[PDB]
Short mmCIF file of C-alpha atoms (C1' of nucleotides) and ligand atoms in Angstrom, two decimals:
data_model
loop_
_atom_site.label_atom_id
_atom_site.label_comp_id
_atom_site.label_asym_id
_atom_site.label_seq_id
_atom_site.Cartn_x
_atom_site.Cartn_y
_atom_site.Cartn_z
CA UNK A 16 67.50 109.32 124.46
CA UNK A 17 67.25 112.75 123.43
CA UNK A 18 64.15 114.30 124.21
CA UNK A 19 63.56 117.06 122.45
CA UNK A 20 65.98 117.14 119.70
CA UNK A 21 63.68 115.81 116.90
CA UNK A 22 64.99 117.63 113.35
CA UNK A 23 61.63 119.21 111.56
CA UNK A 24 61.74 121.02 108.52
CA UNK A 25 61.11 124.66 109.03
CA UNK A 26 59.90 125.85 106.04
CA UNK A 27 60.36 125.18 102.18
CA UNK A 28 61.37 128.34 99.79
CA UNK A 29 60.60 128.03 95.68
CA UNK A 30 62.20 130.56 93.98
CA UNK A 31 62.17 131.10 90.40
CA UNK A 32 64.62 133.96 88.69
CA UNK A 33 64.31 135.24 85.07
CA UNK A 34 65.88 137.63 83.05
CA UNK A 35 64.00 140.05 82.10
CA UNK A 36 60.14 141.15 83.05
CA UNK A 37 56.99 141.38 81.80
CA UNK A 38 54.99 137.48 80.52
CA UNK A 39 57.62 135.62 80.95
CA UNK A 40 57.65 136.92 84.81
CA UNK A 41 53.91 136.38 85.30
CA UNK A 42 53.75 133.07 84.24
CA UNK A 43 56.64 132.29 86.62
CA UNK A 44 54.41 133.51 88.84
CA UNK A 45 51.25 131.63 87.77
CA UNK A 46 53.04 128.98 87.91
CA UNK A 47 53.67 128.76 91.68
CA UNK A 48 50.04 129.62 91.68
CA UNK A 49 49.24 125.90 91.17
CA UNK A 50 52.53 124.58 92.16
CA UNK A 51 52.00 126.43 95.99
CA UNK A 52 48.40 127.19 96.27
CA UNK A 53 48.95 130.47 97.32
CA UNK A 54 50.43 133.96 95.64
CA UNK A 55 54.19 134.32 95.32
CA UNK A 56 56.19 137.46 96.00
CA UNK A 57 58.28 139.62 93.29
CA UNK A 58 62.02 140.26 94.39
CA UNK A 59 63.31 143.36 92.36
CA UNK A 60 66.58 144.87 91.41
CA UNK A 61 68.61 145.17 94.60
CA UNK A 62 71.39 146.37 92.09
CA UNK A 63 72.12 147.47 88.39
CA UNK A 64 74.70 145.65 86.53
CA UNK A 65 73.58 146.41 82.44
CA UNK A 66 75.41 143.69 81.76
CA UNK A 67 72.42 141.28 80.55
CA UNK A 68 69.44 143.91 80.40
CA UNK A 69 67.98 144.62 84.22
CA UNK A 70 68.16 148.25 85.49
CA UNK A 71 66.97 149.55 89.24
CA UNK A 72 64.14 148.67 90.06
CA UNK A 73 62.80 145.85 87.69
CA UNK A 74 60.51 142.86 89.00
CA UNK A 75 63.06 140.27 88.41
CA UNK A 76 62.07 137.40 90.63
CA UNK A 77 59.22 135.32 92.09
CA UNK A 78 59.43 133.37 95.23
CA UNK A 79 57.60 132.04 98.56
CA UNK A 80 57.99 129.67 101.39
CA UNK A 81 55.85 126.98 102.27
CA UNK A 82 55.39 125.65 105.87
CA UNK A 83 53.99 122.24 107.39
CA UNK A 84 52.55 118.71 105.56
CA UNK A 85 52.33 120.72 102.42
CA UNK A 86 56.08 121.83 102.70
CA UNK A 87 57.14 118.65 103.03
CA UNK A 88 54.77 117.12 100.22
CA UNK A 89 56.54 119.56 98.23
CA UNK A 90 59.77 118.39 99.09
CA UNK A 91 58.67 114.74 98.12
CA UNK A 92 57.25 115.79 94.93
CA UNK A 93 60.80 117.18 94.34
CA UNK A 94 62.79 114.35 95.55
CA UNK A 95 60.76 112.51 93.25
CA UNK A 96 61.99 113.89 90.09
CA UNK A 97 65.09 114.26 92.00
CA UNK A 98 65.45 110.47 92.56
CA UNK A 99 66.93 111.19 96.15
CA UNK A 100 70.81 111.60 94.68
CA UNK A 101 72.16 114.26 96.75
CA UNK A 102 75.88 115.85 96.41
CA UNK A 103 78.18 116.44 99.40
CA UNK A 104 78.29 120.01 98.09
CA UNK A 105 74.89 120.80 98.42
CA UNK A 106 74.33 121.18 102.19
CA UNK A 107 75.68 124.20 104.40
CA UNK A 108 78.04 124.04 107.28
CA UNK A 109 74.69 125.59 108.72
CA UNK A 110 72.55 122.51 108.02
CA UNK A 111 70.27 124.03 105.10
CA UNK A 112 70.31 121.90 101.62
CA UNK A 113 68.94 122.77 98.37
CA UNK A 114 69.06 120.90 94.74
CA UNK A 115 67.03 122.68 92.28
CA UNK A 116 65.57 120.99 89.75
CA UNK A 117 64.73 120.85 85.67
CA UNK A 118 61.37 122.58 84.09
CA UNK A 119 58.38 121.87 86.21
CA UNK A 120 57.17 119.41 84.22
CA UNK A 121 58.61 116.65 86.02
CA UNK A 122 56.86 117.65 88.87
CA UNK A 123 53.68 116.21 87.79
CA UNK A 124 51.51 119.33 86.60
CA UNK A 125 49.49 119.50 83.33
CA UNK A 126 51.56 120.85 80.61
CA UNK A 127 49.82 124.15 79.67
CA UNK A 128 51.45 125.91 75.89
CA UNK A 129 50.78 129.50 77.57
CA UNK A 130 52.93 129.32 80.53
CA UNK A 131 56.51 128.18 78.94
CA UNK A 132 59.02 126.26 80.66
CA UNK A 133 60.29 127.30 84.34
CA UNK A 134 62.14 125.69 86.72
CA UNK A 135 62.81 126.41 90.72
CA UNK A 136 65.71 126.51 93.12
CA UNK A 137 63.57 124.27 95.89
CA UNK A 138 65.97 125.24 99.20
CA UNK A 139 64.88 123.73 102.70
CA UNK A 140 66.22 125.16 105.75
CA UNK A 141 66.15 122.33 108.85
CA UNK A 142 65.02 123.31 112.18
CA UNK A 143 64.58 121.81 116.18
CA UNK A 144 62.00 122.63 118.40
CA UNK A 145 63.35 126.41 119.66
CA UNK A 146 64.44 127.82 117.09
CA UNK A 147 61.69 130.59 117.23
CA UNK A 148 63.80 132.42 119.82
CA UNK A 149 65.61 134.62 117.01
CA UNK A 150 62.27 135.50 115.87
CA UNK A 151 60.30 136.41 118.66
CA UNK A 152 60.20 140.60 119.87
CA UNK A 153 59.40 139.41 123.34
CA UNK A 154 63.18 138.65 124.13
CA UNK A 155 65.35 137.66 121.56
CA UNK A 156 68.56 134.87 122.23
CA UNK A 157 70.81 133.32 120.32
CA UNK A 158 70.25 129.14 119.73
CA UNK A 159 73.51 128.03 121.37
CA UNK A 160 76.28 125.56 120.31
CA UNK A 161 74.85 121.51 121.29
CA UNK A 162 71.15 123.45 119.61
CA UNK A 163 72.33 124.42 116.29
CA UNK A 164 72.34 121.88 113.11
CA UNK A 165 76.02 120.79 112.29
CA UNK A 166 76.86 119.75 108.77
CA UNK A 167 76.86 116.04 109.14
CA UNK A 168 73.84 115.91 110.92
CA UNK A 169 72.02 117.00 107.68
CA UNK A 170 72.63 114.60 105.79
CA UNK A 171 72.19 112.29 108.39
CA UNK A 172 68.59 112.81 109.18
CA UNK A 173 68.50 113.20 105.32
CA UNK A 174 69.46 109.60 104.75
CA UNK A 175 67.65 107.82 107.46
CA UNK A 176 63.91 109.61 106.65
CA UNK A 177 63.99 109.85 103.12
CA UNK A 178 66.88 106.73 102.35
CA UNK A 179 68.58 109.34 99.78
CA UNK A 180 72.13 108.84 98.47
CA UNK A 181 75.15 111.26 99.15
CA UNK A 182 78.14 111.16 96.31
CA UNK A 183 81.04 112.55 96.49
CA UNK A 184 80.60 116.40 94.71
"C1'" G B 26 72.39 213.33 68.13
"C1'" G B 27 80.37 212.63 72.37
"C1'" G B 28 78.64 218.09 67.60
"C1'" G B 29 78.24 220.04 72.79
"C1'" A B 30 77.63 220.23 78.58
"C1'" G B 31 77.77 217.66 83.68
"C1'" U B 32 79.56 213.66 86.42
"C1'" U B 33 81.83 208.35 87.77
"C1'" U B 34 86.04 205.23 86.74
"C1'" G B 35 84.70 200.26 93.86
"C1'" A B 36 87.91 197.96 98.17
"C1'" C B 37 91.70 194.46 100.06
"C1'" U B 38 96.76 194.10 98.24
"C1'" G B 39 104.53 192.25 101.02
"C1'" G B 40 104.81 199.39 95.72
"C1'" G B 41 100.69 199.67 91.80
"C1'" G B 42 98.34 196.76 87.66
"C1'" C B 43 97.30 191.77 86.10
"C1'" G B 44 96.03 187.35 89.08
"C1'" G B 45 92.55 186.07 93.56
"C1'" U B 46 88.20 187.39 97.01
"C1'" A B 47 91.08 186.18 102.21
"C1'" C B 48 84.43 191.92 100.70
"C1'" A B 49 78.41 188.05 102.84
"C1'" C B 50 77.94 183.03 105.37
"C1'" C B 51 79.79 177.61 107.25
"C1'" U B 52 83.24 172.68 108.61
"C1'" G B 53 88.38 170.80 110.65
"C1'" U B 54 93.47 172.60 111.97
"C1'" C B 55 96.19 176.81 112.79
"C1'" A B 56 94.76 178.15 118.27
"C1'" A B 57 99.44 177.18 122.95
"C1'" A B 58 93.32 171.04 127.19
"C1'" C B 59 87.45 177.63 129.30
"C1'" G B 60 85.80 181.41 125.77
"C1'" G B 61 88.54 184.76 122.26
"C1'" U B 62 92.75 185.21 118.96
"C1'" A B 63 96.09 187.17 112.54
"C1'" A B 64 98.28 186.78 107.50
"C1'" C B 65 96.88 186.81 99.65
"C1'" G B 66 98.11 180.61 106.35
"C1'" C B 67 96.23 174.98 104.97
"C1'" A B 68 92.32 171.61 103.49
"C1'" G B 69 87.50 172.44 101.60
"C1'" G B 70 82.35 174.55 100.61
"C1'" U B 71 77.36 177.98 100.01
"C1'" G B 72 73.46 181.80 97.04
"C1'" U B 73 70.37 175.33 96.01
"C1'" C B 74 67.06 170.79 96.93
"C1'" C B 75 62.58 168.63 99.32
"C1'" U B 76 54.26 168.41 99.50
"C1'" A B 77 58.68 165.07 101.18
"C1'" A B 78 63.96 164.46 102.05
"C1'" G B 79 58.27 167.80 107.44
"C1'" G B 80 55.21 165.47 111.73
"C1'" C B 81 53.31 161.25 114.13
"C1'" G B 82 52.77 155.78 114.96
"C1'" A B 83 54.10 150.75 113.70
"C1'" G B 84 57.28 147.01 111.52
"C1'" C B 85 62.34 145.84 110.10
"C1'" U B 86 67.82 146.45 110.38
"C1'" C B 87 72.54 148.49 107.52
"C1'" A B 88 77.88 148.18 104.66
"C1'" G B 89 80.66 143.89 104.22
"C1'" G B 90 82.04 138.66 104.75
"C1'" G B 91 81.45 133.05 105.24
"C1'" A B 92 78.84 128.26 103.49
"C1'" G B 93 74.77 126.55 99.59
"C1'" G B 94 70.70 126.57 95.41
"C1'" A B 95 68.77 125.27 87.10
"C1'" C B 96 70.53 128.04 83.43
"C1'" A B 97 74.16 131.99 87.03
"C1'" G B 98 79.64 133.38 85.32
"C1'" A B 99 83.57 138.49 90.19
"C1'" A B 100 78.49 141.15 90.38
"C1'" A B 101 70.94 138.92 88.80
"C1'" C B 102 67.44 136.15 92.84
"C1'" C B 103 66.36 132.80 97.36
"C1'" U B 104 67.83 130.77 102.38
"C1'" C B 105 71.25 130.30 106.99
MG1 MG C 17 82.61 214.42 77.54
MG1 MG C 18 93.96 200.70 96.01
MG1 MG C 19 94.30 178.40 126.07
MG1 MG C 20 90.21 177.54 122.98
MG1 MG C 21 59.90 154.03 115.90
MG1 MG C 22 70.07 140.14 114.33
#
RNA sequence: GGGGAGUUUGACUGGGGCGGUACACCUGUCAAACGGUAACGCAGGUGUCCUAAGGCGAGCUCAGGGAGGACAGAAACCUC
């Protein structure tokens, strides 16, 4: 059949948004520490509303991406907790699906009483074998029309690897 | 120390004074497809700020919009 069209995920981004900074914020960002095995990076005030308490340029949020078998044993480890239930509102007309999920302690890490409670937004983006042209400086091109990830084909390749369940959002 | 002595009381201006600076320097139109071209013609500005808001090299792309993600709501952060 086809032979190169074999959906991979391309990476896995955690992202975790409080209110305000300061301990709160760093233990958000311990806690990917352990969660990701590798440091997270702050997103900060790209505007300034006053409406809840953030001004310009205020650490805000912590986030990163994971890539590979460990990106996808994340996944799992969210699925888990997530039972594989997924709404028909939750994927993209691009492809791209995210649930987000309760406090991390569902996740299966050792309750600690310094951190707090945190959750994470957990969004995977799908991908096909080419889809570093966009990226590349060499000579950049656009992925095409039969190359890009419809909507149905998400949840597709969702139900047949992982046997989830799609309601009705 | 106007008791006394000397001298001055800017200019433009639809009379003069008051008002204003058209009195020094810029942007667009007036301005009639080179340049130049007036009115107290119009619409606006300037007497500052920057050890970076200068220079070089590298990386990236902005404003906005569309579809999604726990608290998140028109506007918080992440991804396409
Ligand atoms: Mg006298
Ligand atoms: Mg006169
Ligand atoms: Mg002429
Ligand atoms: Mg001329
Ligand atoms: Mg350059
Ligand atoms: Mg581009």
């Amino acid at each position: 059949e086809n032979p190169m069209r074999e959906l991979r995920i391309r990476k896995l981004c955690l992202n975790i948004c409080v209110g305000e900074s300061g301990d709160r914020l760093t233990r958000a960002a311990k806690v990917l520490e352990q969660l990701t095995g590798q440091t997270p990076v702050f997103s900060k005030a790209r505007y300034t509303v006053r409406s809840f308490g953030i001004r310009r340029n205020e650490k805000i949020a912590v986030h990163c991406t994971v890539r590979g078998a460990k990106a996808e044993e994340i996944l799992e480890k969210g699925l888990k907790v997530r039972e594989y239930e997924l709404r028909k509102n939750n994927f993209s007309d691009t492809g791209n699906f995210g649930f987000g999920i309760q406090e991390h302690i569902d996740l299966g890490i050792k309750y600690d009483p310094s951190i707090g409670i945190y959750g994470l937004d957990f969004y995977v983006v799908l991908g096909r074998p080419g889809f570093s042209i966009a990226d590349k400086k060499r000579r950049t091109g656009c992925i095409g029309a039969k190359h890009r990830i419809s909507k149905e084909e998400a949840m597709r390749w969702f139900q047949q690897k992982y046997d989830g369940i799609i309601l009705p959002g």
